[PDB]
Structures are given as structure tokens and as C-alpha cells.
Design a binder for this molecule. Structure first.
Ligand SMILES: CC1=NN(c2ccccc2)C(=O)C1
Ligand SMILES: [Cl-]
Ligand SMILES: [Cl-]
Length: 163
């Protein structure tokens, strides 16, 4: 574990992370996809060998020795708010089991089911709170990646408000 496990947020491409593993915002089919998934595909394409996995699950594939945890959040265009909420919580719980299993001291993570899978709604608080519920029991350093200046500020405020 990390000596003093922490949460941090950075506004930059998760493909440039400084952590021991990365969480992909994957599609269920293991396709290159869009947004974070496409950035992950360019940096670690070898990790998309047999990465297909159902909604609400995570599947780790090694790129060399670097673990890529493919986490499948729901696309809120297809799910009810209720069922989508359940699957989004579940995907983060599966990320926490994989981070623990791998024995990493740090993990790079995006906010699942924001952007293209958001169903046109602001889900920063919903996705971040499910991330916290899953990762709070882990002792890895968690570095949350985002691309929007206002989301960076709101994620930073949410981390500090619990400290
Ligand atoms: C920046 C981001 N804005 N959003 C977003 C999406 C729909 C409505 C409002 C906000 C994201 O998912 C990431
Ligand atoms: Cl960047
Ligand atoms: Cl963002």
C-alpha cells in the first residue's frame, strides 16, 4: 500500500499518468471506442487482447507488465437512471477488487459514465461518490484524471471537503 493513502486530481491525458496502473473507461466489446478509451487504445493497444467484459465489471489485461483495468460503466442512453446507477456503483467495486488483487501502490482513474455514456447529464458528483465508496477501503494512492477546468475545481473541492 501507499504509506499515507491519498486522493489527488489532475487535468491532463490519462495516457501520460505517473501511476502503477490505469483504469480504462472501456466499452463492453473491447473496441478502441472514443474519449479516454481511444487515448488508452493509442498508448496500450496490446491491452485490448480479449478485454471484452459485461457492463458493471472490470477485466485487467497486461501491456508488458503495466496493468490496464478495463472498467465498463453503463451508457445512460440505454439504462434507466435506477439500473444505470446500480451498474455504475458495481463497475467501481470491481475496480477496487482488481487494484487490491494487483498489489499496486497507485492507480490512475477517470470518472466512469461521464462524457459519451452520460446520457447528456452532468454526473460528476454521482460518478465521483461511487468512486469514493469503492476505493475508500483500498490503500492505493488514487489519481483522478479529467480534461475540464471547472470539473478539476469541483473534484478538488470534493476531495478536500472530506479531509
Ligand atoms: C467536462 C464534462 N462535462 N460533462 C457533462 C456532460 C453532460 C452534461 C453536463 C456535463 C461530462 O460528462 C464531462
Ligand atoms: Cl495532456
Ligand atoms: Cl472532464
Amino acid at each position: 500500500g501507499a504509506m499515507a493513502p491519498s486522493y489527488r486530481v489532475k487535468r491532463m491525458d490519462i495516457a501520460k499518468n505517473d501511476e502503477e496502473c490505469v483504469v480504462n473507461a472501456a466499452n463492453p466489446r473491447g473496441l478502441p471506442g472514443d474519449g479516454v478509451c481511444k487515448a488508452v487504445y493509442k498508448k496500450w493497444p496490446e491491452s485490448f487482447k480479449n478485454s471484452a467484459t459485461p457492463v458493471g465489471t472490470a477485466k485487467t489485461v497486461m501491456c508488458g507488465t503495466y496493468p490496464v483495468i478495463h472498467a465498463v460503466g453503463p451508457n445512460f442512453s440505454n439504462y434507466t437512471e435506477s439500473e444505470g446507477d446500480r451498474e455504475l456503483a458495481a463497475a467501481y467495486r470491481e475496480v477496487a477488487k482488481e487494484v487490491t488483487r494487483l498489489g499496486v501502490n497507485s492507480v490512475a482513474i477517470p470518472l466512469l459514465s461521464t462524457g459519451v455514456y452520460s446520457g447528456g447529464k452532468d454526473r460528476l458528483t454521482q460518478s465521483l461518490n461511487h468512486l469514493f465508496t469503492a476505493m475508500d477501503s483500498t490503500d492505493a494512492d488514487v489519481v483522478i484524471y479529467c480534461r475540464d477546468k471547472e470539473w478539476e475545481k469541483k473534484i478538488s473541492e470534493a476531495i478536500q471537503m472530506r479531509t
